[PDB]
Design a protein around this nucleic acid. Sequence first.
DNA 1: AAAAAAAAAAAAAAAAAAAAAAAAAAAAAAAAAAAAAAA
DNA 2: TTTTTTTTTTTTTTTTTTTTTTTTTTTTTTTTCCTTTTTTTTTTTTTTTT
RNA 3: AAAAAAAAAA
Lengths: 49, 84, 49, 49, 49, 97, 49
Amino acid sequence: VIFNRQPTLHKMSMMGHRVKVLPWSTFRMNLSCTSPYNADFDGDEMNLH
Amino acid sequence: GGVPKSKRITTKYMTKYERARVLGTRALQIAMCAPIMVELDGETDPLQIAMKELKQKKIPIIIRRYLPDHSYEDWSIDELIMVD
Amino acid sequence: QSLGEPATQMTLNTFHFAGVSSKNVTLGVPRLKEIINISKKPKAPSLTV
Amino acid sequence: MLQFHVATLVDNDMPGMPRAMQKSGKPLKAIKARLKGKEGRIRGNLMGK
Amino acid sequence: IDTAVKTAETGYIQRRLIKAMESVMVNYDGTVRNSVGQLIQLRYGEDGL
Amino acid sequence: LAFLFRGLFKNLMKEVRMYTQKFIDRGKDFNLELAIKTNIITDGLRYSLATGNWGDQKKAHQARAGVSQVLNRLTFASTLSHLRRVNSPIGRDGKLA
Amino acid sequence: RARDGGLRFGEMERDCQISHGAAQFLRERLFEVSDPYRVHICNFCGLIA
DNA sequence: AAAAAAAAAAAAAAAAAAAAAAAAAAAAAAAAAAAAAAA
DNA sequence: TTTTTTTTTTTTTTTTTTTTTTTTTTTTTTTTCCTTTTTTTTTTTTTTTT
RNA sequence: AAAAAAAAAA
Ligand SMILES: [Zn+2]
């Protein structure tokens, strides 16, 4: 899948990922991916294609 | 505008943009029940078979590279050399 | 994209400024605006002689 | 009146010309208003569908 | 205040920069050309790397 | 609300003037209760409080928007903060700091 | 969400998908899964037939 | 009991800041053509 | 009686002012309100008269 | 179902 945070500033703001299906209801990603996405985990919404 | 084989001036090395579309087109072909050119060891996802027969350079794709003067060079898969 | 992405990060040095030289200089993103737009009148023209 | 109706069918934002008065207190949204804009047919429906 | 005012012209600058250079591509002869085929650089970054 | 009442009272006087001028040129008298259209003031205040566009309904494009807002009922502090809010008339697009 | 609408694949997504060099993902997200259509065109006149 | 005038209901109608490019008008020196004085 | 010398009249640019026009980050979620209206003409109705 | 406005999230 393709994983995207808005606003898109550079090339690494939407990247490929592999789906692991997990129980609860939020898109759980790794922590090292916080730097390219500029994510903060404080209510950030993020898109999947 | 077919450039002859001795007169080809493009690079002899498959870059990632050729590799992605060759792998995708070959995976779509294997998924649409084409014959598989190599042996099998239990792989079911046809993109894995696409890499597996890309390693032995046994994929029947002619890449038509377009020069900016609207001329084209035809390169086979086995004429190119894999790098990753 | 690799030139417009640093433009979002051109505000972290806003504070802790006092000024040592009294020379009119445009700094930051509007100075970038003066070079992208090719302004025939810059805000702070200066010669280094 | 015919020239006014033709032009405000085509273009409604040109200054110096009376505005095409729609019923609900709004101006007419002409073809230029459909095409030109961030939310128009080019940027909002063709580059960004 | 500095975070709000700027963000608009930074995004406008990013859109202008990405629209001025959206079709500049390294070609198969190693040269760098735009959409019209006009030559820009004989090698990308003057070294082709 | 005083400015709104000025506008609606001027419109009411204009409507009453038009009615009594229509009924004075025929030489007949008129009734005061039929002369006053009571929907003018009520409809104008109701529209300018429900919508928030602060002026005439036909000419709401020249009027300020967002003067009247829906009261925020999420917490008691949110209601108290909405009841003690001050808005600057400068639009939210100024590059000046 | 209330009208069951899709996500906005905006201009910056197109920008960085150009930056990735992925033509097929762009053709998918901007023609295949948004609004495909087939039209019949006269060869001599080039208009809709 | 039949014909005409005034009143009321129903239906159509029109009423913000910035920056660059182009157009315009007063001016102003330059250059070619026409009229006058003198040898 | 012809040549130079002054005057005139266009001619092209210059320069400044004015006018015009176009632009203003990306995505997402909730409500509220309106999506006519008074004026003029036409048609029907009701009352009155001979 | 459309259009406009307002309140917000990153
Ligand atoms: Zn045709």
